[PDB]
Amino acid sequence: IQEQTMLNVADNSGARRVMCIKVLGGSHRRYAGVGDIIKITIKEAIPRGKVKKGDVLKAVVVRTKKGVRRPDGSVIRFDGNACVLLNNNSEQPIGTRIFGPVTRELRSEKFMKIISLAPEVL
Amino acid sequence: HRKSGRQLNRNSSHRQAMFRNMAGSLVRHEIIKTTLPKAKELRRVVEPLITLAKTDSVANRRLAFARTRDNEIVAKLFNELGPRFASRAGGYTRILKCGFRAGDNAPMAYIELV
RNA sequence: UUGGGUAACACUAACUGGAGGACCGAACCGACUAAUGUUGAAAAAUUAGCGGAUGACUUGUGGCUGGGGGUGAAAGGCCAA
RNA sequence: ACGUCCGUCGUGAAGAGGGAAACAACCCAGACCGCAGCUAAGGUCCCAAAGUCAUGGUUAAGUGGGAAACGAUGUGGGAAG
RNA sequence: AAGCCCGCUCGCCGGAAGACCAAGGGUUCCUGUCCAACGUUAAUCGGGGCAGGGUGAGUCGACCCUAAGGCGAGGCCGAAA
RNA sequence: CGACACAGGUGGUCAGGUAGAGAAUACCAGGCGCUUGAGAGAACUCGGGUGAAGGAACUAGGCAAAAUGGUGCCGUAACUUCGGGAGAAGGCACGCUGAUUAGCUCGCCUGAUCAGUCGAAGAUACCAGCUGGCUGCAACUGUUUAUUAAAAACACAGCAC
RNA sequence: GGCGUAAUGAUGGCCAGGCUGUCUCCACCCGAGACUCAGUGAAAUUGAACUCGCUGUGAAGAUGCAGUGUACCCGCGGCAA
RNA sequence: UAUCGACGGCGGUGUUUGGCACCUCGAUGUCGGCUCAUCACAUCCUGGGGCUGAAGUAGGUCCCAAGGGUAUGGCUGUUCGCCAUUUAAAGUGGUACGCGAGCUGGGUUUAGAACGUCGUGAGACAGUUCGGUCCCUAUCUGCCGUGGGCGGAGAACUGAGGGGGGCUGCUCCUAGUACGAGAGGACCGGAGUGGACGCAUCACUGGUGUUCGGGUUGUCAGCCAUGGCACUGCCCGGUAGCUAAAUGCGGAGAGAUAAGUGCUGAAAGCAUCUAAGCACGAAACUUGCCCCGAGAUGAGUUCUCCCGAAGGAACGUUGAAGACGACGACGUUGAUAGGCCGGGUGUGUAAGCGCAGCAAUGCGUUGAGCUAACCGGUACUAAUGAACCGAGGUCUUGACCA
What we know:
part of a larger assembly, 2 chains, A: mainly beta, five-stranded mixed β-barrel, two-stranded antiparallel sheet, 1 helix, globular, B: mainly alpha, 19% helix, RNA-binding
């Protein structure tokens, strides 16, 4: 995942697709892996209710195309890409429910609330 | 580099080619003379060629006239030079290298058929 | 030209006819960008691309006009590298 | 602006030889030949040829050589309330 | 004798390295004997060197005439190519 | 002809020899092997064929490369000197095999029907437009530096003196 | 000559879809070679000497000045100060 | 006098600019960028410190430090600018404003043309704009690597010196706690992990193949089957191996100093970190560690090989070797290579016939054939003979032995 990329949403904030802008705490030739918070600007969504289409918010990558290897030696790969929008409240999804599975290292050690809402875990 | 495979003394085409001919030479005349890489690989053009052409039948005589384009020394390979090598496996037609000749310095034996 | 509507003016449909320094092209024509070549055959060629293509076209042979000339849709361009 | 134009000096000019480490101008001193002696330049402990020479003193810094506006009871000497 | 010749096998070209010709070149064609010289190797090979032979039409072409145009003669202009 | 047996240049006839949409590839006839060699699976180019993901981000400019790119059916906008633009765009079909219909005198001619059937791909092997929008300039074809500029330069019908 | 303008134009700038190595970075392979061997065999190019290194100096980044140190011969391949 | 700091005075640097023409215009073609090789420091964060408008906290300014990291776009040909989204940091200067016999050329200083301005004008204008070439098979020297010889040789080693980096962040055990009315908002050490730069190795995951298998067009062998040619025809896939978005590994500690903190102790019988002495004290220094390495002038060592023979170069068959050379193994006391067989693999259903079927080719017989640059067994085949380089135990001179 790099800048100006298009990924799908996992939460229900009224947004459909998202256009990756940049990552927080990462200066490299285009990049944004799973677990890395990145500020973006959704593209397709609901232009009403609350100015959504056009605003720039923060999100957390959950699934990507790139395959990551695990301690056992097996690599996992997904179709496209997805992310979850978060608000100002220190790491807190804006939506209510989340769609799509999640990793393990993204639980215990790091987020403990995102897992509580995770309907699937690989 | 890598392991030792075949040996294309020239290019690709010049390299099936060459094998055929100078292959039917060791069935038309029990004496041939090439070079160093000579018939060392032609020892292969012949057996394969013998066997699968050992016992006379339909699914053998054809394989013969497929590598060697000739009717004269394709039938003689049968009824002669077999049944003539009946109870003998391998050792079809070997040969011991010979000193190089004039012109292009290159040692060459004389295939022969034992 | 035929048929139909209309008075006519003309119009519509079909058919016929097929022009047009028109477009794609056999043979080929032109030839923007680069590399090769640059004591190349020597007076400027090769390769990968690229564009335009029956006429005011192209071409052989013969003939006519010459230097301060002529000629020139003038580029100071051409008049035997 | 790697000047025009004056002045002093000095060289490039017409200069040896020679020291200054090397050097156009600083110091001393001026080319025949071969040869002998004694001096100058400078050098004189060794390579290097010549006294590790005489009297007296300073510095101790190895300073022996870039170094400044400015500071200092580092130290020595002298005068005065 | 790796590139002179024979057989076989393996390929190239087809508006083309095929067939017939213009211009131009010009005997370079063929045969025999050789190769010192020529052939970007060698050569018993040659469009190479030497000596011979070959191009026997009334109806093929030349020869003849004419187009743009040109020349000579008379006429007319210091003079005249 | 170009100094040379210099991949340069040079007129006419053979464009029905055989297979396709043709004077395109493969191949009889005919001709030819007269465009220096031998051995080793470097670094080191020019020629050449495209890459997993992204994809012009390179760049003066996507130059270069690639892509669309046969045929038949359906369908096709703005604009217009209604001639056109339009093979606009867009979409589908297009293999083979068996048995047949229709047009025609017939074709080793053409257009279709039904059924069966194979591959990832059926114009599965010979070409070949990428499309679209905005803006500058010139009208266009044509003409122009034979040896670096063809361009908004030149010319042109028309208008005027 | 000002303004403005269909169709066309290998004209200049710019944006989108699709696509592409053009780029971010890049593996090997194929044909013809390079490296070596038989045969055939030029033309370009040079004041002399010449293996330096470390400092210093010099118009303050000379191998060739000054002071020291040092330096074994030849050969192959490259990227090239 | 605790940031700021006028007037005035005194200096340093020379990155800026103006610029006194001895140097080059018998010419070191122009700016910037680009690409490529080599040699350094007046720095933003982090680290260690000084001042403080330093109460604390948070900041301002200055010194030190490269150790790591400075990896990107849109308009313009433009260099130093409008701007955007990130970034803990993403300083600066020299190298004939390093670098074109390394690249790129987009710019400027050519033949066309357009435009303004100047001119009546051609034409002009260090005014602008569109299009427009930048060469050479390095001989020497230097450097990066590889060899042959010389100091009698084969094999096995050593090895002075030479080359080298670590930094940052997240999380857990401990803070939204200490401090503070509130707002606001800090701290050893031991560990796990997130970003990165440094010898190799791949079994695992993945990328590749003119080995191989399949489909298919033209054409030829009459057809079928099975094949040749377009030097895999074309299209699809793909093993080994090499590789990759792969994997394993990459200290601590010790010693000596700077800033600084102290001890003992004078000059000034007090005091004082010093002046003599002395205890501690930095990611930096040396070493440790890894790599290169006798052309490292202390230019090495070892054993054995020529001191009339105690070997070696040449040769033959092959590589755990390799551009030439070298290097390494074997040479019958042989398996080194090939053949055969087997093992381990790649594909995928055979020839023929029966019944198949009009046929393409659909079926049954065959979950059958064909093929391989692995390994093993096995010498069955192929590693002979013979020649040759070749100093000959150089001296003056200490102990022991006889």
